[PDB]
Design a protein around this motif. Sequence first.
Motif, PDB file in Angstrom:
ATOM      1  N   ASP A  37       0.090  -1.168   0.334  1.00  0.00           N
ATOM      2  CA  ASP A  37       0.232   0.703   0.042  1.00  0.00           C
ATOM      3  C   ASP A  37       1.007   0.840  -0.012  1.00  0.00           C
ATOM      4  O   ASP A  37       0.323   2.370  -0.552  1.00  0.00           O
ATOM      5  CB  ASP A  37      -0.855   0.115   1.333  1.00  0.00           C
ATOM      6  CG  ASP A  37      -1.767  -1.042   1.287  1.00  0.00           C
ATOM      7  OD1 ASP A  37      -2.306  -1.010   0.135  1.00  0.00           O
ATOM      8  OD2 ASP A  37      -2.429  -1.213   1.982  1.00  0.00           O
ATOM      9  N   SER A  38       1.645   1.176   0.666  1.00  0.00           N
ATOM     10  CA  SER A  38       3.110   2.704   1.074  1.00  0.00           C
ATOM     11  C   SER A  38       3.282   2.560  -1.198  1.00  0.00           C
ATOM     12  O   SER A  38       3.535   4.204  -0.403  1.00  0.00           O
ATOM     13  CB  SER A  38       3.572   2.496   1.771  1.00  0.00           C
ATOM     14  OG  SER A  38       4.391   0.987   2.442  1.00  0.00           O
ATOM     15  N   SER A  39       3.851   1.912  -1.311  1.00  0.00           N
ATOM     16  CA  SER A  39       4.511   2.327  -2.505  1.00  0.00           C
ATOM     17  C   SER A  39       3.587   2.729  -3.873  1.00  0.00           C
ATOM     18  O   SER A  39       3.995   3.601  -4.243  1.00  0.00           O
ATOM     19  CB  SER A  39       5.008   0.260  -3.273  1.00  0.00           C
ATOM     20  OG  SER A  39       6.319   0.211  -2.545  1.00  0.00           O
TER      21      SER A  39
ATOM     22  N   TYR B  73       0.871   4.355  -2.790  1.00  0.00           N
ATOM     23  CA  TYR B  73       0.229   5.865  -1.973  1.00  0.00           C
ATOM     24  C   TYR B  73       1.095   6.320  -1.618  1.00  0.00           C
ATOM     25  O   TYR B  73       0.667   7.812  -2.562  1.00  0.00           O
ATOM     26  CB  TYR B  73       0.057   5.710  -0.146  1.00  0.00           C
ATOM     27  CG  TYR B  73      -0.366   7.114   0.674  1.00  0.00           C
ATOM     28  CD1 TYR B  73      -1.872   7.861  -0.193  1.00  0.00           C
ATOM     29  CD2 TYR B  73       0.799   7.524   1.534  1.00  0.00           C
ATOM     30  CE1 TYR B  73      -1.965   8.589   0.734  1.00  0.00           C
ATOM     31  CE2 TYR B  73       0.011   8.675   2.222  1.00  0.00           C
ATOM     32  CZ  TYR B  73      -0.974   9.450   1.388  1.00  0.00           C
ATOM     33  OH  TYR B  73      -1.262  10.464   2.489  1.00  0.00           O
ATOM     34  N   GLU B  74       2.431   6.237  -1.470  1.00  0.00           N
ATOM     35  CA  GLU B  74       3.969   7.653  -1.557  1.00  0.00           C
ATOM     36  C   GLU B  74       3.982   8.069  -3.656  1.00  0.00           C
ATOM     37  O   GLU B  74       3.928   8.942  -3.427  1.00  0.00           O
ATOM     38  CB  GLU B  74       4.715   7.343  -1.467  1.00  0.00           C
ATOM     39  CG  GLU B  74       4.866   6.805   0.246  1.00  0.00           C
ATOM     40  CD  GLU B  74       4.938   8.200   0.948  1.00  0.00           C
ATOM     41  OE1 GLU B  74       4.471   9.142   0.788  1.00  0.00           O
ATOM     42  OE2 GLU B  74       3.525   8.282   1.566  1.00  0.00           O
ATOM     43  N   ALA B  75       3.870   7.068  -4.248  1.00  0.00           N
ATOM     44  CA  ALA B  75       3.776   7.089  -5.394  1.00  0.00           C
ATOM     45  C   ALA B  75       2.633   8.628  -6.081  1.00  0.00           C
ATOM     46  O   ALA B  75       2.505   9.349  -6.208  1.00  0.00           O
ATOM     47  CB  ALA B  75       3.826   6.515  -6.495  1.00  0.00           C
TER      48      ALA B  75
ATOM     49  N   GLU C 157       9.833 -15.712   3.570  1.00  0.00           N
ATOM     50  CA  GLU C 157      10.033 -14.223   3.617  1.00  0.00           C
ATOM     51  C   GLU C 157       8.168 -12.682   3.754  1.00  0.00           C
ATOM     52  O   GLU C 157       7.552 -13.347   3.578  1.00  0.00           O
ATOM     53  CB  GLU C 157       9.225 -14.091   1.963  1.00  0.00           C
ATOM     54  CG  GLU C 157      10.022 -12.646   1.677  1.00  0.00           C
ATOM     55  CD  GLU C 157       8.713 -12.033   0.269  1.00  0.00           C
ATOM     56  OE1 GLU C 157       9.403 -13.263  -1.064  1.00  0.00           O
ATOM     57  OE2 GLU C 157       8.368 -11.677  -0.193  1.00  0.00           O
ATOM     58  N   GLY C 158       8.693 -11.925   5.405  1.00  0.00           N
ATOM     59  CA  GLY C 158       7.877 -11.821   6.242  1.00  0.00           C
ATOM     60  C   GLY C 158       6.824 -12.397   6.849  1.00  0.00           C
ATOM     61  O   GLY C 158       7.299 -13.102   7.253  1.00  0.00           O
ATOM     62  N   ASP C 159       6.365 -11.690   8.611  1.00  0.00           N
ATOM     63  CA  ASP C 159       6.403 -12.226   9.445  1.00  0.00           C
ATOM     64  C   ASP C 159       4.682 -12.759   9.197  1.00  0.00           C
ATOM     65  O   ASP C 159       4.394 -13.054   9.672  1.00  0.00           O
ATOM     66  CB  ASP C 159       5.448 -10.493  10.556  1.00  0.00           C
ATOM     67  CG  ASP C 159       7.418 -10.498  11.131  1.00  0.00           C
ATOM     68  OD1 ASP C 159       8.669 -11.571  11.275  1.00  0.00           O
ATOM     69  OD2 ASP C 159       7.131  -9.118  11.348  1.00  0.00           O
ATOM     70  N   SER C 160       3.729 -11.695   7.644  1.00  0.00           N
ATOM     71  CA  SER C 160       2.432 -12.569   8.041  1.00  0.00           C
ATOM     72  C   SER C 160       2.880 -14.055   7.755  1.00  0.00           C
ATOM     73  O   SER C 160       1.810 -14.780   8.027  1.00  0.00           O
ATOM     74  CB  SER C 160       1.602 -11.396   6.457  1.00  0.00           C
ATOM     75  OG  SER C 160       1.079 -10.384   7.892  1.00  0.00           O
TER      76      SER C 160
ATOM     77  N   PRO D 246      11.626 -15.122  10.187  1.00  0.00           N
ATOM     78  CA  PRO D 246      10.665 -14.555   9.284  1.00  0.00           C
ATOM     79  C   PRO D 246      11.950 -13.332   9.023  1.00  0.00           C
ATOM     80  O   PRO D 246      12.480 -12.798   9.768  1.00  0.00           O
ATOM     81  CB  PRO D 246       9.695 -13.978  10.045  1.00  0.00           C
ATOM     82  CG  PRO D 246       9.433 -14.516  11.499  1.00  0.00           C
ATOM     83  CD  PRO D 246      10.942 -15.507  11.457  1.00  0.00           C
ATOM     84  N   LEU D 247      12.044 -13.128   7.397  1.00  0.00           N
ATOM     85  CA  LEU D 247      12.693 -12.207   7.382  1.00  0.00           C
ATOM     86  C   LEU D 247      12.148 -10.654   7.133  1.00  0.00           C
ATOM     87  O   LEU D 247      11.506 -11.060   5.983  1.00  0.00           O
ATOM     88  CB  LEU D 247      13.942 -12.714   5.848  1.00  0.00           C
ATOM     89  CG  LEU D 247      14.556 -14.167   6.523  1.00  0.00           C
ATOM     90  CD1 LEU D 247      15.317 -14.317   5.343  1.00  0.00           C
ATOM     91  CD2 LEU D 247      15.935 -13.764   7.496  1.00  0.00           C
ATOM     92  N   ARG D 248      12.677  -9.567   7.449  1.00  0.00           N
ATOM     93  CA  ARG D 248      11.200  -8.847   6.980  1.00  0.00           C
ATOM     94  C   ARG D 248      12.230  -7.791   6.174  1.00  0.00           C
ATOM     95  O   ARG D 248      13.254  -7.143   6.260  1.00  0.00           O
ATOM     96  CB  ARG D 248      11.483  -7.681   8.282  1.00  0.00           C
ATOM     97  CG  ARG D 248      11.112  -8.148   9.680  1.00  0.00           C
ATOM     98  CD  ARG D 248      11.152  -7.738  10.669  1.00  0.00           C
ATOM     99  NE  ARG D 248      10.550  -7.515  11.824  1.00  0.00           N
ATOM    100  CZ  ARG D 248      10.679  -6.104  11.953  1.00  0.00           C
ATOM    101  NH1 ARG D 248      10.783  -5.598  11.920  1.00  0.00           N
ATOM    102  NH2 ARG D 248       9.398  -5.884  13.625  1.00  0.00           N
ATOM    103  N   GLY D 249      11.089  -8.006   5.347  1.00  0.00           N
ATOM    104  CA  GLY D 249      11.938  -7.649   3.309  1.00  0.00           C
ATOM    105  C   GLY D 249      12.934  -8.158   2.843  1.00  0.00           C
ATOM    106  O   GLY D 249      13.591  -9.314   3.053  1.00  0.00           O
ATOM    107  N   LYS D 250      13.808  -6.892   2.419  1.00  0.00           N
ATOM    108  CA  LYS D 250      14.956  -7.246   1.468  1.00  0.00           C
ATOM    109  C   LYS D 250      16.405  -7.462   2.335  1.00  0.00           C
ATOM    110  O   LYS D 250      15.997  -7.021   3.249  1.00  0.00           O
ATOM    111  CB  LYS D 250      15.486  -6.303   0.468  1.00  0.00           C
ATOM    112  CG  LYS D 250      14.610  -6.206  -0.347  1.00  0.00           C
ATOM    113  CD  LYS D 250      14.295  -6.751  -1.761  1.00  0.00           C
ATOM    114  CE  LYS D 250      13.369  -6.890  -3.239  1.00  0.00           C
ATOM    115  NZ  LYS D 250      13.547  -5.858  -3.340  1.00  0.00           N
TER     116      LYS D 250
END
Lengths: 481, 480, 188, 187
Positions: free
Chosen positions: A74-76, A78-80, C19-22, C40-44
């Motif tokens: 959502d942030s990607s 919204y910010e654009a 990939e991610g917390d969810s 879990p790995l938070r993003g890149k």
Amino acid sequence: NERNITSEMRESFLDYAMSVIVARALPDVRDGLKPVHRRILYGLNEQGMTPDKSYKKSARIVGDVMGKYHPHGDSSIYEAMVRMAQDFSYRYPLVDGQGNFGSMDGDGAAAMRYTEARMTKITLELLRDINKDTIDFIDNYDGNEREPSVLPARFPNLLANGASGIAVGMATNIPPHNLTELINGVLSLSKNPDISIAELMEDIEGPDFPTAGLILGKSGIRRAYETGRGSIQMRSRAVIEERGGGRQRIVVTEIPFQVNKARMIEKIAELVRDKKIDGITDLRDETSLRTGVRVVIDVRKDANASVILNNLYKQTPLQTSFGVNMIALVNGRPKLINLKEALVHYLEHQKTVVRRRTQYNLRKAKDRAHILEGLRIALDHIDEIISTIRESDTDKVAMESLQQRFKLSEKQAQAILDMRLRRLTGLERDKIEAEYNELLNYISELETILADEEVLLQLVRDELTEIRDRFGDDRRTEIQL
Amino acid sequence: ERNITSEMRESFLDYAMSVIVARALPDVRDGLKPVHRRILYGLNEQGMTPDKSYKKSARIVGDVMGKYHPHGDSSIYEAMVRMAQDFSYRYPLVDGQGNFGSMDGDGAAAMRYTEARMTKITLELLRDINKDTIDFIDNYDGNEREPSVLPARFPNLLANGASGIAVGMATNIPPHNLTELINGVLSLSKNPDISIAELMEDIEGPDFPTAGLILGKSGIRRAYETGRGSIQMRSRAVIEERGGGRQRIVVTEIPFQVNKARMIEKIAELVRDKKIDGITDLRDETSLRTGVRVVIDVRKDANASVILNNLYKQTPLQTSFGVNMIALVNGRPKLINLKEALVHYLEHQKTVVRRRTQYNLRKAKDRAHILEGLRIALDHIDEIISTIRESDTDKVAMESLQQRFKLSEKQAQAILDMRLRRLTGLERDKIEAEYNELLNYISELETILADEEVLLQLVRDELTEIRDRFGDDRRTEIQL
Amino acid sequence: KLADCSSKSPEECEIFLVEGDSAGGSTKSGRDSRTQAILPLRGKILNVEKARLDRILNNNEIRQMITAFGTGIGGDFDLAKARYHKIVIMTDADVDGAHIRTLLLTFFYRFMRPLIEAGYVYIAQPPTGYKGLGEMNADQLWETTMNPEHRALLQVKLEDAIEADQTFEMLMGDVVENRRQFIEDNAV
Amino acid sequence: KLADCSSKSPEECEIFLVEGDSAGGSTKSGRDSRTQAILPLRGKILNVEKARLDRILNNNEIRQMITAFGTGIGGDFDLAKARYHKIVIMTDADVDGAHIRTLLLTFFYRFMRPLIEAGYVYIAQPPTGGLGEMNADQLWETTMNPEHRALLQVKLEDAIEADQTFEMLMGDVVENRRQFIEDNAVY
DNA sequence: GAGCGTAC
DNA sequence: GGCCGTACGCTC
DNA sequence: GAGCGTAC
DNA sequence: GGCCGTACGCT
Ligand SMILES: COc1cc([C@@H]2c3cc4c(cc3[C@@H](O[C@@H]3O[C@@H]5CO[C@@H](C)O[C@H]5[C@H](O)[C@H]3O)[C@H]3COC(=O)[C@H]23)OCO4)cc(OC)c1O
Ligand SMILES: COc1cc([C@@H]2c3cc4c(cc3[C@@H](O[C@@H]3O[C@@H]5CO[C@@H](C)O[C@H]5[C@H](O)[C@H]3O)[C@H]3COC(=O)[C@H]23)OCO4)cc(OC)c1O
Ligand SMILES: [Mn+2]
Ligand SMILES: [Mn+2]
Ligand code: NA
């Protein structure tokens, strides 16, 4: 199964590298948009978020864009959308936002929940004639929706609003330009296809930033326009006001493009504290919505203010360079393009958009005329038409009987059966005839455009001049020489 | 200047009443709190029926928030999540795809990661909504219209229950078995002077989605007679004999609104603090195929039956359900008994069916009037066409048709809007067949409106239809 | 951040880098709590090829992996000290998932090279499509990508060490030009 | 955190307790940076009537208010040490806004009693048509500009009556609160 | 107890 | 509902 | 030197 | 895009 580490690294990295290049960080040469921007603007159009309609909460606009076209965070999205509503980021803002959309001090926009948005009047020109088979539509990420591959873009957006995107193996940095100057450039190119970049520079003087400011020399601009790469020196608008007897003060009214005002003031404060610069008594930010940008620098009496100002340009971002790297997606592939190449690809897109629109409009006109021809036959032989329908047991027999007896097509026969009894009145008979006569003249006009390349080119020119006279504005950035 | 005492009294009352009538308490008629009603009406307005593909949760919430619920996204989303949880709702109202959380108290994945649509049973809550059955009200901004109550063709208040903390009061209604509830409504419709003990012949007691066991009918009876009472919920646990004289406890069902992971954590806390002895190992063997499975290994010297009885008293392996049946009756909170809840529900069904019949009769009489005009036209079609052709405008055509064929404005307009295809053999017969069937339909609706017993029987028949389609076996065993 | 398994026998134990917390929350619910552990790995993740040792060692994500495996890094690496015999990379079926996967393999090749040689590093194969890992329910995530009887893991094998050394340098290194040329040559 | 004003003269200075951070950001932009200070309150604040001193003193939001006013609490309270002569409660025109307002008045009556007696506590009057959606410059022109704003001075007429009111409405005893709602609205 | 479920 | 990590390339 | 703008 | 404060009533 077993996979080689070298083969896995080569295949996985290439998949990501190419996706960031063709479907993320780089804009298209035709409409000047990255996929996220195109999906926001198409979303706003599909949502009916036109300038005449009331503002809609940002979380709702983002939700629809995310759910239908953009399968990312959502942030990607919204910010654009935020940048598109910022008058300091976009030379011709594409989004009309309500609430806190951030300022020049680098402070971000208020969360999606606290902001409302709709498209600007100029955005209607990017989406103009979209449903007239002007552009190719593609399947979305899940295949449950349809999205445009490119927008018709009735104004040269790539150069008008610029681009700044970091891809993989490459990056892009296109400055914003003046619309009046750009359209004049396209009109000059349409009249002379062998136009020189120096001749195109008679119309397009150089980049025009929304934050105005000053440009030091045409030399850097010329290199950027001829090669696609070059350095342009951006200088702040500063006046040395004679504040009394022997006292002085530097007043900054305009700052360079993509420069954080608060961070720039922080840098001057850093130099005063570290004693790297002398002659400054006070540093204030008197920026307000009514007065605009105002940075006041108080100078000591008998201390040379002109010298301090020149030192501030060299030591602080009060004078920053714009590193031009004109890379846009040309035929779905990245390419370093010059000023002429950018205008050539844009004009060629306009020719295709107008030709396809004329082809679409002619198909609908010929189809309607064919229907009206059937209704005209029916209105001349009413008694016979009705008797043919009444004697028929089913709609299928009625269709077959009308087609055979009155030499009608399948479409013509259907139209007669779908015709209401009120269409048999005096005025309704005259209305059908008046529509048909006007339509024959319309078919003629569209056929003239499709037959001659010059008639088509003139229509493109006329439509561009119309955009220039309605959305064209004065130059903001002064180019000093 | 404002008085501090007057300001405290007025401001607190404004909030207290809003939490009571427009937040934490459900309506006796449809068994929903405003947030739940707004989600379900939203899903209906969005066309999110069970036959259609799932829609992202952020989009469902956005629409609900934007036109009916002027509150935080999390309040709307978390209320929607519970409705999709088969362990929270006895008859789930939302069909969710993705992570909607489990019995171990781990929450649902954020809106962006989940998608939803309504369940088949939810169509029964919204059935006949656009048939002038319920009163519509203006939304928070006055730019939209929202229902004050849903038609609710099944007794939802008792079916899924309620648990809401208001101001000065709270509510705690347990979920019940639909087959048992509908039978209770049918028994009440046949005998309005029915006793709560006689209603208990159909409604044995509460039926939790997490199944389990209920200790005694005594607590249930008090809850049904007064509106308040304590019901003891016990876990389904078996002591199995094993080799070498060893024993083990297997828990297959846990009490309602109890966190399974926290319950295991509590047993582990007693073993480390040495508050309970005779336990060697504690495992959670819960899988999708076997369902809930909590294994407790017993020491050779220790008596397993004794440890199990100690676990019921010391851990949430045996929890009580504090019944406090408060629902909004005529927009006001009221502590209601089992009979009162079924009386208000049956009375709502009578109103919904009566209003539907009144609506359907209006539309049937209007359609028959139109068909009467088309029938006149089809008998004198040469004359009708000649009258239209001689007319210069639609206004003159209307004027001429009404005067020459003794037609109304609505009738003459329908004839002018009539397509040429209506003149074919089958299309003429179709108009006549529709009109004959409509006369018999008007007669049927007039029979319902004239006699209260005919109306009551229709309510009964429609309820039996819900019972035979959505009715299921009892999950919670009531022990004596 | 690591949700460890009950068993202390590394031979039967396995770790899943999600990939991610969810997705992490879904994996920790659907998993076999006895043999499977989740990180879990938070993003890149930080690119170790472009970073200096002081940044790598102070990185929260990098630190958490070393602690989870309990082997150490570089010269102080010990295969006998391994807590899991199976290190499974479980990323989304998208382009960004492939990027996180490259970043992890870059860390494993430069700091835990004998871990790949021993065939301890694996790649999970989740169902391909528009739907991510965090978008999946906890039960289907176990049935398709975690259950030893139904899953399809890809064993990461090092055939040529000299070839790999130059590949990581080209793809993940600081000099852009060689990476640009690779993309231009292999573009489809 | 607290966004304080430039002036150090408490007589001319005033503090605005705003409901939320978004409203707080709007209030800090529309305000008179010289005489007006802003303290944003993150949602519902702790009910001091139901809590013991150890919880009240450990509470983040309660602590922030004491630090902002710089007067102290209870027996150690000093009116001369006040940093603002006007403490304005600025909550949303909704039912939850009225609740936050009651919770604040409960804290002010039980811990800063002479602050109400001196007529330092006020209530802002926004139109009922919330602060989170209130427009920037309009929020200053309607409830902040001293010339045309309408503030309500919180006055203590009867101390014995008020004492029993806060105990009934905000106290632990539910039974008396239920009877109050029943008498003044349900029946 | 502490944690249920709609609110800020 | 505010706090805040990483990739990626270019030019200061 | 560090920070632009779409991504996780 | 997860962490996490408070009101409110009941047992
Ligand atoms: C916590 O749960 C996860 C988080 C993440 C990261 C993330 C990671 C962080 C961290 C922050 C973030 C955060 O980035 C922030 O976004 C902000 C959004 O508004 C804009 C204006 O400003 C952005 C910040 O510039 C950025 O810092 C996340 C947003 O979406 C992500 O993917 C980001 O601070 C500490 O480590 C990945 C995951 O796996 C998928 C997770 O499970
Ligand atoms: C930070 O700035 C403000 C915060 C708030 C609070 C708040 C306050 C907190 C805090 C958290 C929260 C948070 O609550 C959380 O919501 C979560 C939403 O997802 C679900 C899954 O889980 C919920 C948490 O259980 C809940 O605790 C806010 C959400 O909406 C609010 O009203 C909450 O942790 C510490 O203090 C109010 C404001 O003014 C109105 C603010 O300006
Ligand atoms: Mn993904
Ligand atoms: Mn509010
Ligand atoms: Na117990």
